[PDB]
Design a protein around this ligand. Structure first.
Ligand SMILES: *[C@@H]1O[C@H](CO)[C@@H](O[C@@H]2O[C@H](CO)[C@@H](O)[C@H](O)[C@H]2NC(C)=O)[C@H](O)[C@H]1NC(C)=O
Lengths: 62, 50
């Protein structure tokens, strides 16, 4: 355990550059049940994590 | 002789910047599969400093 932190449409971007994990986020209300609505928005950065951990796979949890 | 400090002796590829690798997977230096068993051409990736 090298790190531990504790504190509609949601968009996230995950990138891993030089061992740094950048997570950009954005939220917005929506009214649609088919797919993601057509439109444009910007996803500001929210987290930079110094994991230095190899990444080749991920999996969501609901 | 203090052997508590270790160094990785084998790896399939070089590290990217600030990467951290603490794996202990047995490295197969030969054609014989190791199946997690150390031996000839089957090495523990870490080795102690003397
Ligand atoms: C991170 O780990 C992956 C393993 O999932 C490494 O990719 C493997 O590299 C070997 C090198 O010969 C290949 O034989 C495998 O096929 C690769 N696997 C995958 C899934 O790509 C990767 O090199 C590692 N990177 C770092 C920076 O540690």
């Amino acid at each position: 355990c090298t790190f531990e932190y504790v504190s509609n449409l949601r968009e996230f971007v995950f990138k891993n550059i030089d061992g740094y994990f950048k997570i950009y986020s954005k939220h917005t209300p929506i009214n649609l049940v088919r797919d993601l609505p057509q439109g444009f928005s910007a996803l500001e950065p929210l987290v930079d994590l110094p994991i230095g951990i190899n990444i080749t796979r991920f999996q969501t949890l609901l | 002789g203090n052997y508590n400090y270790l160094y990785r002796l084998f790896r399939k590829s070089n590290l990217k910047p600030f990467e951290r690798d603490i794996s202990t997977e047995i490295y197969q230096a030969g054609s014989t599969p190791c199946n997690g068993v150390e031996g000839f051409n089957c090495y523990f990736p870490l080795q102690s400093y003397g």
